[PDB]
Structure 1
Amino acid sequence: KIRLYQFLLDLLRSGDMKDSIWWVDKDKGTFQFSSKHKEALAHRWGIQKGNRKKMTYQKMARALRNYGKTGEVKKVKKKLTYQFSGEVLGR
């Protein structure tokens, strides 16, 4: 089963939901969600995972918070903005 950070990285690379997520500075690995269209992306995550309940952005962002310690994704101090680690990016 795909990991959340890889799901997001693949979307950014493919461009398939450009109205829900986008690079801010791709060289730095910073990206941002759409305030109005992020829920459609969260829904896609839950369906790809086969989860029992409908996925929400709040539940997806909670999983993102859990990467804070191990470092794969860090929250940036700008609205709806995150940053991948160089390690995640280099793969």
Structure 2
Amino acid sequence: KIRLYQFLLDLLRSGDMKDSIWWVDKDKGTFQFSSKHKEALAHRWGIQKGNRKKMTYQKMARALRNYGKTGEVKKVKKKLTYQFSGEVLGR
């Protein structure tokens, strides 16, 4: 199956769900979620995984926080803003 960071990057690269997520600085890999439309994006994540329960942004963001040590996706100090690693962007 597809990893969450790759699902998010795929969305960004295709301009699907443009109301839900967008680049802030695409060269740096900084991207941002919509306050009001993030739940439809998380909902789509959960379906794509076939999960038992419905996926919510909180649980998606819980998953994102695990990337913080290994580094694929880091939280930026702005509202709803994260950043892909350079390694993630090069692939």
Settle same-fold status: TM greater than 0.5: yes
Structure 1 unmatched ranges of 5 or more:
none
Q: Deviations over 1:25-82 (max 9, x none)?
A: 0000000000000000000000000000000000000000000000000000000000
Structure 2 unmatched ranges of 5 or more:
none
Q: Deviations over 1:6-35 (max 9, x none)?
A: 000000000010000000000000000000
Aligned residues: 91
With the length of structure 1 as denominator, give the TM-score of the two structures: 1.00
With the length of structure 2 as denominator, give the TM-score of the two structures: 1.00
Identity of aligned residues (%): 100
How far apart in 1 are the matches of 2:72 and 2:20?
21
Q: Shift of the alpha carbon at 1:84?
A: 0.2
Q: RMSD of the TM alignment (CA)?
A: 0.2
Following TM superposition, the consecutive aligned residue runs of length 4 or more in structure 1 with deviations greater than 4 angstroms are none
